[PDB]
Amino acid sequence: SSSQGLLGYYFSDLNFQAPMVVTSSTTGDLSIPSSELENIPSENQYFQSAIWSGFIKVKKSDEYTFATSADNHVTMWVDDQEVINSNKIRLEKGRLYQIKIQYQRENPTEKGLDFKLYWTDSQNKKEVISSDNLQLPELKQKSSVPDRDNDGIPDSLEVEGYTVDVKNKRTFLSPWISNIHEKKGLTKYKSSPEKWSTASDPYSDFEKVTGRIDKNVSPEARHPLVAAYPIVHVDMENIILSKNETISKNTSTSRTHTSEVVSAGFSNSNSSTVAIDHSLSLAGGLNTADTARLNANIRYVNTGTAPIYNVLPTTSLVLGKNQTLATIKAKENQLSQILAPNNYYPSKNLAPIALNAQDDFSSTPITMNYNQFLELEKTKQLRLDTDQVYGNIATYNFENGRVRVDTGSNWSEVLPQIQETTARIIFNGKDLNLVERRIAAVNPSTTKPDMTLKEALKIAFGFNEPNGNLQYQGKDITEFDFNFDQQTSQNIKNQLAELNATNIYTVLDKIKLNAKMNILIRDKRFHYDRNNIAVGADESVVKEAHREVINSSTEGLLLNIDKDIRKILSGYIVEIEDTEGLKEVINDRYDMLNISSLRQDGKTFIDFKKYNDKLPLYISNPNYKVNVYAVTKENTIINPSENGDTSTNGIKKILIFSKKGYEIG
Ligand SMILES: [Ca+2]
Ligand SMILES: [Ca+2]
Secondary structure, X not given: OOOOOOEEEEEOOOOOOOEEEEEEOOOOEOOEOHHHOOOOOOOOOOOXXXXXXXXXXXXXXXXXXXXXXXXXXXXXXXXXXXXXXXXOEEEOXXXXXXXXXXXXXXXXXXXXXXXXXXXXXXXXXXXXXXXXXXXXXXXXXXXXXXXXXXXXXXXXXXHHOEEEEEOOOXXXXXXXXXXXXXXXXXXXXXXXXXXXXXXXXXXXXXXXXXXXXXXXXXXXXXXXXXXXXXXXXXXXXXXXXXXXXXXXXXXXXXXXXXXXXXXXXOOOOEEEEEEEOOOOOOOOOXXXXXXXXXXEEEEEEEOOOOOEOOOXXXXXXEXXXXXXXXXEOOOOOOOOOOEOOOEEEOOOOOOOEEOOOOOOOOOOOEEEOHHHHHHHXXXXXXXXXXXXXXXXXXXXXXXXXXXXXXXXXXXXXXXXXXXXXXXXXXXXXXXXXXXXXXXXXXXXXXXXXXXXXXXXHHHHHOOEOOOOOOEEOOEEHHHEEEEEOHHHXXXXXXXXXXHOOXXXXXXXXXXXXXXXXXXXXXXXXXXXXXXXXEEEOOHHHHHHHOOOEEEEOOOEEEEOOOHHHHHOEEEEEEEEEOOOOOEEEOOOOOOOOOOEEEOOOOOEEEEOOOOOOOOOOOOOOOOOEEEXXXXXXHHOOOOOOOOOOOOOOOOOOEEEEEEEHHHHO
């Protein structure tokens, strides 16, 4: 508990107008050595005034006399009862007494401040007040030292710009100073002087930048304009079907975002889609009055910016458009760990959660009638709808200076405000998964910081401009498309008009965000479905992606393929073409295309043996060709056609390799 003591404001001017340093002292020693004033301009290092605030707490009732290093330039009050300008004052045990210390000094010939706070009890024991008796003011939001929102940062600094510099034992909040601060690698902040939390979340602007916050809040959300909140969906890893009173397959799940009509949506609901493996795992009985049972392994996923402690959200497992087959619930207050941002529950190094645990004989079975099982087979897809019922928030406590789960703070009270006051940006550049972030933005309809689209991209997703050109990890911003909801689209379209700009990438630094916008940014190389899941890529892109052939034989192809490309590929078709042009498909079945696998070295191996009776391809003549085709997710057939055809005939495939027997060797 290091944020113990009084909160001090140090001004360079004589009448509390130019805040230079805002920081806390641990004990009665309120001194700031010039040694730690490096980032402050030489002249402003001469503090002409200062104000301290907090509370005093005594373990045993008694009468005290307060004094300071310079009683002549000070005015202190205890409970608004003026003590210095100095008589004894009684303080009962178990009571917090508010302190306010004022200090003015016109003639600083010295830099920094040497100023201590003392007190003497009834016996004549005089000593600098200990950390044990001091505590910061309750800088929490108010019911319905210029600090309109009570977060602790002066209104002027929030509006003008400020930064924080961690000294050896303290963190100094200071106004932004370009020449000094920029080249020191410090971040310039600007927050609303009217909002305790500028992004409307449970942590204040001061708590965020000063580090008086949950260790699990994402680094980017420690910025007062970036919202810190959980975002959870369920990830099904595998499933097993059985006849009620066996089909065991791997599943791929993707968090989703539904577009309307082409145009991103307004939904702030969680949901994921599961695709069950359609390929043979082994090889290969139900009637109209049987029932099948479903079990599966799952993990909760937090892709947001704040953790969860005592309530996992509820989820509906859905078949088709709206046939709920189960309601998945976790036990409130019985979590075995927290669900951290950019993390899982349970953690990936631990076993996943079974819907019906081997343990639990009393778990509700997930049942399907005969028609349902047919529907599931027909689609081989499931949906997981999850509510936004998170629990209590681990908040910072000024009394003890520790972060703890607060039973009085609840996410449900927070989410609506965050959603109404910020701009949403969903970006998939990291690994093609949809990642959502919310940035504080003004309701067009004079307090909040203006926010440009470029800056949002920088503080929320970590984009940068090494030469003034915005990029996300070496990838130019033009490699990503911008999609908006209808309203936002017209808004942006209008902004362009006033700028006489016809292109967005050209004026990103000048497009301003407003609260309630919905912006979707996706990698341009891929095909997306209505859920915004990457389901394909142009033939040209795919062909190009298979150019790096490290090896080829009658046994298989070894290649280097982009991780994002491999994600949109469902399978490969192997074929031998004779000198006549006639073909022979080796793995001639819609469920036998699962011949690719990633190696430890990250190289892809396409296995010719798998579906060739574990024997290497037999190329009767070296003038014969081996063609290998790639099938993408969106073109994947998962059942026999409607007659009964199970061949690869009719499958939209992309030629990605073709060489003669002698070229392959
Ligand atoms: Ca403030
Ligand atoms: Ca504020």
